[PDB]
Design a protein around this motif. Structure first.
Motif, PDB file in Angstrom:
ATOM      1  N   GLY A   8       4.590   8.547  -1.173  1.00 48.43           N
ATOM      2  CA  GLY A   8       3.640   8.884  -2.238  1.00 48.43           C
ATOM      3  C   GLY A   8       2.301   8.173  -2.028  1.00 48.43           C
ATOM      4  O   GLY A   8       2.270   7.053  -1.531  1.00 48.43           O
ATOM      5  N   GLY A   9       1.175   8.817  -2.384  1.00 46.59           N
ATOM      6  CA  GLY A   9      -0.167   8.213  -2.223  1.00 46.59           C
ATOM      7  C   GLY A   9      -0.875   8.557  -0.920  1.00 46.59           C
ATOM      8  O   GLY A   9      -0.365   9.335  -0.110  1.00 46.59           O
ATOM      9  N   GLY A  61      -5.676   1.706   0.445  1.00 46.77           N
ATOM     10  CA  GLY A  61      -5.266   3.043   0.094  1.00 46.77           C
ATOM     11  C   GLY A  61      -5.441   3.333  -1.388  1.00 46.77           C
ATOM     12  O   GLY A  61      -6.000   2.548  -2.150  1.00 46.77           O
ATOM     13  N   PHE A  62      -4.932   4.484  -1.788  1.00 47.37           N
ATOM     14  CA  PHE A  62      -5.091   4.998  -3.147  1.00 47.37           C
ATOM     15  C   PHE A  62      -3.792   5.607  -3.614  1.00 47.37           C
ATOM     16  O   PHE A  62      -3.137   6.374  -2.879  1.00 47.37           O
ATOM     17  CB  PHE A  62      -6.208   6.069  -3.137  1.00 47.37           C
ATOM     18  CG  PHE A  62      -6.450   6.751  -4.465  1.00 47.37           C
ATOM     19  CD1 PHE A  62      -5.585   7.747  -4.919  1.00 47.37           C
ATOM     20  CD2 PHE A  62      -7.544   6.410  -5.245  1.00 47.37           C
ATOM     21  CE1 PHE A  62      -5.798   8.405  -6.121  1.00 47.37           C
ATOM     22  CE2 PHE A  62      -7.804   7.081  -6.451  1.00 47.37           C
ATOM     23  CZ  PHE A  62      -6.919   8.088  -6.895  1.00 47.37           C
ATOM     24  N   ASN A  63      -3.386   5.251  -4.837  1.00 42.70           N
ATOM     25  CA  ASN A  63      -2.197   5.857  -5.434  1.00 42.70           C
ATOM     26  C   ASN A  63      -2.506   6.539  -6.763  1.00 42.70           C
ATOM     27  O   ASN A  63      -2.050   7.658  -6.980  1.00 42.70           O
ATOM     28  CB  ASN A  63      -1.003   4.894  -5.539  1.00 42.70           C
ATOM     29  CG  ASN A  63      -1.254   3.692  -6.425  1.00 42.70           C
ATOM     30  OD1 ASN A  63      -2.406   3.287  -6.691  1.00 42.70           O
ATOM     31  ND2 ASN A  63      -0.164   3.076  -6.873  1.00 42.70           N
ATOM     32  N   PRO A  76       0.824  -1.218   0.000  1.00 40.97           N
ATOM     33  CA  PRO A  76       0.000   0.000   0.000  1.00 40.97           C
ATOM     34  C   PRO A  76       0.863   1.275   0.000  1.00 40.97           C
ATOM     35  O   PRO A  76       2.005   1.256   0.486  1.00 40.97           O
ATOM     36  CB  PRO A  76      -0.848  -0.144   1.274  1.00 40.97           C
ATOM     37  CG  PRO A  76      -0.928  -1.670   1.452  1.00 40.97           C
ATOM     38  CD  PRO A  76       0.471  -2.132   1.096  1.00 40.97           C
ATOM     39  N   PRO A  77       0.315   2.399  -0.493  1.00 44.37           N
ATOM     40  CA  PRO A  77      -1.065   2.574  -0.970  1.00 44.37           C
ATOM     41  C   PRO A  77      -1.233   2.142  -2.422  1.00 44.37           C
ATOM     42  O   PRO A  77      -0.414   2.475  -3.291  1.00 44.37           O
ATOM     43  CB  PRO A  77      -1.291   4.081  -0.833  1.00 44.37           C
ATOM     44  CG  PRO A  77       0.092   4.664  -1.021  1.00 44.37           C
ATOM     45  CD  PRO A  77       1.068   3.680  -0.461  1.00 44.37           C
ATOM     46  N   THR A  78      -2.325   1.435  -2.689  1.00 46.74           N
ATOM     47  CA  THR A  78      -2.620   0.958  -4.046  1.00 46.74           C
ATOM     48  C   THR A  78      -4.114   1.007  -4.294  1.00 46.74           C
ATOM     49  O   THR A  78      -4.861   0.259  -3.657  1.00 46.74           O
ATOM     50  CB  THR A  78      -2.209  -0.539  -4.218  1.00 46.74           C
ATOM     51  OG1 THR A  78      -2.774  -1.308  -3.149  1.00 46.74           O
ATOM     52  CG2 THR A  78      -0.728  -0.723  -4.253  1.00 46.74           C
ATOM     53  N   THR A  79      -4.562   1.788  -5.275  1.00 45.07           N
ATOM     54  CA  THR A  79      -5.951   1.676  -5.736  1.00 45.07           C
ATOM     55  C   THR A  79      -6.081   0.293  -6.397  1.00 45.07           C
ATOM     56  O   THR A  79      -5.218  -0.076  -7.191  1.00 45.07           O
ATOM     57  CB  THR A  79      -6.264   2.754  -6.767  1.00 45.07           C
ATOM     58  OG1 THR A  79      -5.634   3.976  -6.365  1.00 45.07           O
ATOM     59  CG2 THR A  79      -7.752   2.957  -6.896  1.00 45.07           C
ATOM     60  N   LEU A  80      -7.131  -0.466  -6.085  1.00 40.52           N
ATOM     61  CA  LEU A  80      -7.199  -1.851  -6.567  1.00 40.52           C
ATOM     62  C   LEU A  80      -8.385  -2.106  -7.474  1.00 40.52           C
ATOM     63  O   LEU A  80      -9.522  -1.838  -7.074  1.00 40.52           O
ATOM     64  CB  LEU A  80      -7.279  -2.831  -5.384  1.00 40.52           C
ATOM     65  CG  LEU A  80      -6.094  -2.847  -4.434  1.00 40.52           C
ATOM     66  CD1 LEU A  80      -6.397  -3.635  -3.165  1.00 40.52           C
ATOM     67  CD2 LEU A  80      -4.844  -3.394  -5.165  1.00 40.52           C
TER      68      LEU A  80
END
Length: 206
Positions: free
Chosen positions: A143-144, A107-109, A83-87
Motif C-alpha cells: 500500500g502507498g 514516500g506517501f501513504n 515507508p511509505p509515510t507522508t510526514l
C-alpha cells in the motif's frame, strides 16, 4: 505545544508521533473516520514527526503490524515508521522559532494538511492523489507510493554523499505536491512559525 490530529479520511488510521528515539505523548492511537486526538509535545522538541498508519492490527498489549508506517509493531510508537509515510515534520523552540514542513522523502501513504492553530504563519499541505498516480516502479505492494531511495537504494536517490539532484521520481512527488520536500536537497518548503505555536494535522483534508 498542542497538536490536534484529525482523521478526515473515510478509513481508520493509526496516528503516530515520535522524535525517532522516543514517543511524543503516547506515541500512537487509533483514529476512526472523523475522530480527533490532541497530543502534547514538549517545548524544544527537535526532529519530531507525525504520520498516519494504515491497515493495522494490534493485540490487547498494543503489539501488531501496519501495512504503512509500522513502527516496530507497536501501537504506541517510540521510533519512526516504515515507508511509505507522508510526514508532518517539526522542530519547536529553535532559537525562538518553530519550523514545520511536510515531506515525501520517505514516500506517501495518506494525504495531509499541517497548519498552525495560532497566529503568525501559514500551513502546508500535500493532498493530491499521489497513491493513485504513483509511478508503477514506486507502487508499494503493501500500500502507498514509495520514495525512490526506499525502492532502489542508490547514492543519488538517498543523497548519501550530500550530493544529489532532482530525479524523475522526485519530480513526480514535486509535481503532485509542490509544497512538500521531494528529495533530501529539495529547495526547502519549511515554514517559520512563532516559537511555541500550536498545530493541527489533518489526514485527508480535502
Amino acid at each position: 505545544a498542542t497538536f490536534e490530529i484529525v482523521n478526515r479520511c473515510s478509513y481508520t488510521v493509526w496516528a503516530a508521533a515520535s522524535k525517532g528515539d522516543a514517543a511524543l505523548d503516547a506515541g500512537g492511537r487509533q483514529l476512526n473516520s472523523g475522530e480527533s486526538w490532541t497530543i502534547n509535545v514538549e517545548p524544544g522538541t527537535n526532529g519530531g514527526k507525525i504520520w498516519a498508519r494504515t491497515d493495522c492490527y494490534f493485540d490487547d498489549s498494543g503489539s501488531g503490524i501496519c501495512k504503512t508506517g509500522d513502527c516496530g509493531g507497536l501501537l504506541r510508537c517510540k521510533r519512526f515508521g516504515r515507508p511509505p509515510t507522508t510526514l508532518a515534520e517539526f522542530s519547536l523552540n529553535q532559537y525562538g522559532k518553530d519550523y514545520i514542513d511536510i515531506s515525501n522523502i520517505k514516500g506517501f501513504n495518506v494525504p495531509m494538511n499541517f497548519s498552525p492553530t495560532t497566529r503568525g504563519c501559514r500551513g502546508v499541505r500535500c493532498a493530491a492523489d499521489i497513491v493513485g498516480q504513483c509511478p508503477a516502479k514506486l507502487k508499494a505492494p503493501g500500500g502507498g507510493c514509495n520514495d525512490a531511495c526506499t525502492v532502489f537504494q542508490t547514492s543519488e536517490y538517498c543523497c548519501t554523499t550530500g550530493k544529489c539532484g532532482p530525479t524523475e521520481y522526485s519530480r513526480f512527488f514535486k509535481r503532485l505536491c509542490p509544497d512538500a520536500f521531494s528529495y533530501v536537497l529539495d529547495k526547502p518548503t519549511t515554514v517559520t512559525c512563532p516559537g511555541s505555536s500550536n498545530y493541527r494535522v489533518t489526514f485527508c483534508p480535502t
